[PDB]
Curated annotation (Swiss-Prot), chains A, D:
Annotated GO biological process: catechol-containing siderophore biosynthetic process; fatty acid beta-oxidation using acyl-CoA dehydrogenase
Species of provenance: Mycobacterium tuberculosis (strain ATCC 25618 / H37Rv)
Taxon lineage: Bacteria, Bacillati, Actinomycetota, Actinomycetes, Mycobacteriales
GO CC terms, sorted: cytoplasm
Metabolic or biological pathway: Siderophore biosynthesis; mycobactin biosynthesis
Described purpose of this protein according to its UniProt entry: Catalyzes the dehydrogenation at the alpha-beta position of ACP-bound acyl chains. This results in the introduction of a double bond in the lipidic chain, which is further transferred to the epsilon-amino group of lysine residue in the mycobactin core by MbtK.
Gene3D superfamilies xref list: Acyl-CoA dehydrogenase/oxidase, N-terminal domain, Butyryl-CoA Dehydrogenase, subunit A, domain 2, Butyryl-CoA Dehydrogenase, subunit A, domain 3
Protein name: Acyl-[acyl-carrier-protein] dehydrogenase MbtN
Induction: Induced by iron starvation conditions. Transcriptionally repressed by IdeR and iron.
Tagged with keyword Oxidoreductase: yes
Domain of life of the native organism: Bacteria
Catalytic class of the enzyme: oxidoreductase
GO molecular function per UniProt: acyl-CoA dehydrogenase activity; enoyl-[acyl-carrier-protein] reductase (NADPH) activity; flavin adenine dinucleotide binding
Family assignment from sequence similarity: Belongs to the acyl-CoA dehydrogenase family.
Length: 371, 373, 373, 371
């Protein structure tokens, strides 16, 4: 019912101008700041967060489906990253300074982004080279972040740093004016996901400390769990959209006297992918039903969805034949190129499988009964 | 929730004696009739069905997990088949005779089984050779059914038949007592030992009140029972896979090779983490489906084919991690699990038949297609 | 062996300047005509073809590996297409006009391309809309061809056409000069940048001697060229996959994460060992096929679909091991490799069409079946 | 031509009585000793080995196809194991005692078998508990071997042992009369592959030493490479046989108005498996063309074939539907149960992938050109 109202709100906010902003963002290969401002103004982040310090997984999942329906990794990932930075601030931001930047972010007045990954420490955030040092009642933050999505338009960056004065990982919020944003990378896909290296050599007040030394990894893991749940939801919705488009093609394209849908090998392949996509969507509902954000569950669902998504898009692109390979005839290549980011961005398959494995429990009694 | 009370009831009924009966049933390759009687006497079918004509998918799923935890396809499948035949009677059985047979089945006083498959028409139930003909205010029933699981112990068989009085639709479902059928010698099978399956020869007459579903409603009646069955198979797979993963992890954490435990070998660890993530996804999906609170033919078809294919991979990879020991019948039971799981892609609807059901309800997206071209 | 001398010749022709032309072709997204001229001038096509009407599969395969080593679908595919059109002329071109065009193509004086695919009939070449009609001792040729690779630089197009003088078989192959066709603007494609592909509009007349294959022999002529092409695609995939595995292993042995190099992470190591074993198997299979010394339509179909599907997996998994860097176009070329490889399952015959060819020649085993039942 | 004569010889030796011996062996779940004696008497091992100390891979592969055609893992594996023990003796057996037992084995007068695997050290043969000690000009050999195929009928066992007097691994030939063969195991499949534990507590002459301490692993690896090439050949032939039987079923079984072969999803699935089985067979010809037994190539081809074989048999069994699951209606279950041994017996996937990985070479120059 609060969820039915949230869905009603998403249906009002995700209108024809959002679809138009998405299409233009794809053509320009840049994130439209007006989307976050529009979602903020519409009360999307406000209705999602309400007065809770911890996220409502049901609302998180419904927003992920809305983003996924746009079939644009850049747009969807961009919004979800902003929202995941909000999740870090809501749970870990104690100062009035942080609660105010968090409120600005919920309103869509400030764009937030994550500064975790580096050239050396991409998957391993423990080997972070970015340093945080206490000086003049504030902090000195120095380092380079490799992949900072939304950095060309962000107002604040959630920087993962290693404290010189002290595990040892901390999170510090740094304003955009105090960082050097490099030229955005030319990437394989996800055009509107403006990603660039960020060079930091500045000072920040003590109030800008999001998570103190020895708590930074818990804070970034919380945001990454929030992000992983969203990526899984976005994959489920974008895969459903791709299956539906592919089916429309299959029912109109005729070859060897029959439509493609009448060719049983293609029909049953699609039915298998549909069944598996439906399973992922039902699983997300099932996870939301528990009403808690769990790090291992988020890791598990995101890796499974990223690997399924890759397959769905590859097989949809295959069914479009030659036309699928022609950029001015179909957009399948763009979908396929965007989806390839899923297994790497937001945590690699291996890192996520290590997190799942770490919490797996043996059954000694059952093993005793089998031997 | 009434669901927490149902779980509490399942925890009471699925006791150490049930575990022992399962083990004995495996050794004897015979279904233990006492399990259905026990579940009936315990109020399991009664609490699941209550006064509803249509099933509570949450309770259906919880019972499937309890059955799945036993890691025995014969035991789990046999119970689910009895309960799916109850689902057919609850929704389609109109006569006082059928409602009484149905009540007996809920009590565990009568064992029901399904006689759908034939030598010719296995997957295609429209091409059933078994005939039903109106005679003397009743019905003549003649035919042979090939894969009737529980037939050696059943009291009534839900027979799918083609009406000769009607024009081909034609399909009907008729309840036939055990005494009025000839059950053949049970088949030696690849696995699922306690799932007593045999051919059933029928040449009999039954009263009009034995008609479960009249000509042209028979396929809907059997599809309803099969949807109920498919949801249960998926839950049994999710639970049995979880049990196998847990046992395999215990083996991995004790077995040492090349100076490390198997769990310390990253290639085995990540492989198990991927299987775990996928079995978890299936379990969450079953909860997601149950929350919708309705039994849908296509959803049941889609979850059972997915689970069957996943379950085959999980058991094969768990068996592989047991190495040579996995191949020794008196050292480990992994081979039995693996042989049992191979039935999942065929029994209760083949992958292809279930993918055809899924495909039949798939809808094109014209607006999105207009945007891509 | 004449094969060792052919390898020696390939080693001389595939020099640092060829490598540089490849790089420039990638940047410009234009096929370098000079490569075909260079290969012709070097005696590559001449040594491959000698005086044979039918191809030497060993030399075909060796040339495919040389092309594959460049890790560029456009460059490799463009050369192979020119050479496959030579295969059609060598076996089917009877007139002095065709033998001269064929000799020019072996010298690298004339670039040949294939005009088979249409907007309607892409995979099904029996439903070609392009028509051929006898007129004034020659032939009228009218139609549109959709995917003509090399058409912006070709001198002659091998056009698959349907004869209106004959009864539907009907299919013919006719050689049409570049000046007598209208080549459309090349398509922007997902990958294979230097593979200049465009639609070709035809409404012209040609002499009788331009007839490559008369009505009812056209499908055999195009299938012959496609079989030659498919064998080459498989060899190009085997070589390009080996190059990708070698580069990825260098990255794995230098890149450190969680205190170890990537190669020291067992899950990545075994994954690469499995891909290596499978690419090795494909390379050995190509040698095995070449030893048979004959070009077979079904064997070419079976090896190309297998290789295309294997190659997609190899490049996707190599790209994955490059992590974020794999996704950055100015840091690594893995994305280009991956985008190029996606063409393999569609260009030169889709998986489904090739599996239909394989299936058509599959033979049942009656004696074994009698022993199993 | 020597190969054409070898094929001609195989066609004469693999007759109706060999097919009858196979069928009876399956029913009895025991290896028919008369098969090895018959193959010996026919000159099969003699023609294969000639006067060479190193195997002719072409002849090795042709014999593997003959064995594979029988569709019986027990029979085929049994013969190949005998022949692999011959390979160890031919290259490593220096004493007249060993050359004579080797000649007896080629004649089919003596059945040989391998005693490598143990309860603790299955995949890791370096951690072997079986000990070899020099005493009274001979050797004292003490230990237990877990999986010794053909042990109930063998005359000599090639025992992998760790020398107390001394890497440290050795191979020693022990006569059957000097070992305690346990009751054969009840196994998942491969019924006629009589496998049992072997308890050794005996003394042997110095002449019985096949490979001295520090050479035993090279000797067992040579035999295992010979065995792996044969397993790959057997899988290729048995998979071809299964595809052909499955196709006969598909062309006679009618469902939903069409034969199974007319159902495109099943047809294209079979075409894919056929294409892949043909690729494996061509690869074996390609490997034989190099005319050398290579440890890594044998490891690579066997693991690839074992994994393909599992898939082929599982999918053939699926196409037989309910009938496939009925033991008195079809033999698909037996094939499926036999094939499951391929990924474990003769080296596990992981051990074989470690051997392949160990010889993989990086391309530094190409990597320099990509970055």
């Amino acid at each position: 019912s609060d969820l039915d109202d949230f869905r009603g709100l998403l249906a009002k906010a995700f209108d024809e101008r959002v679809v138009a902003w998405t299409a233009e963002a794809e053509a320009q290969e840049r994130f439209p700041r007006q989307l976050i401002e529009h979602l903020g103004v519409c009360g999307v982040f406000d209705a999602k967060w309400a007065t809770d310090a911890r996220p409502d997984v049901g609302k998180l999942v419904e927003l992920a489906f809305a983003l996924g329906q746009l079939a644009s990794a850049g747009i969807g990932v961009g919004v979800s990253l902003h929202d995941s930075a909000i999740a870090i601030l809501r749970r870990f931001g104690k100062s009035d300074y942080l609660r105010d930047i968090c409120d600005q972010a919920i309103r869509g007045a400030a764009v937030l982004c994550i500064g975790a990954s580096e050239e050396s420490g991409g998957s391993d955030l423990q080997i972070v080279e970015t340093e945080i040092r206490s000086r003049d009642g504030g902090f000195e933050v120095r380092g380079v972040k490799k992949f900072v999505s939304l950095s060309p338009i962000a107002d604040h960056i959630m920087v993962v740093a290693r404290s010189v004065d002290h595990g040892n990982v901390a999170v510090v919020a740094v304003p955009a004016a105090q960082v050097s944003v490099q030229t955005p990378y030319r990437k394989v896909g996800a055009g509107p996901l403006d990603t660039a290296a960020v060079c930091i050599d500045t000072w920040v007040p003590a109030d800008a400390l999001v998570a103190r030394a020895g708590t930074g990894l818990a804070a970034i893991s919380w945001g990454l769990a929030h992000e992983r749940m969203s990526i899984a939801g976005q994959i489920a919705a974008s895969c459903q959209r791709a299956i539906g488009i592919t089916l429309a093609r299959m029912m109109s394209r005729r070859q060897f006297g029959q439509t493609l849908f009448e060719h049983q090998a293609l029909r049953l392949r699609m039915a298998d992918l549909q069944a598996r996509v439906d399973l992922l969507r039902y699983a997300l509902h099932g996870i939301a039903e528990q009403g808690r954000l769990e790090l291992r569950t988020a890791a598990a669902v995101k890796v499974t969805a990223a690997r399924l998504g890759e397959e769905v898009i590859s097989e949809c692109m295959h069914i479009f034949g030659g036309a699928g390979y022609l950029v001015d005839e179909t957009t399948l290549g763009k979908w396929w190129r965007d989806m390839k980011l899923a297994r790497v961005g937001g945590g690699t398959d291996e890192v996520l499988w290590e997190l799942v494995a770490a919490g797996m429990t043996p059954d000694h009694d059952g093993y005793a009964a089998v031997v």
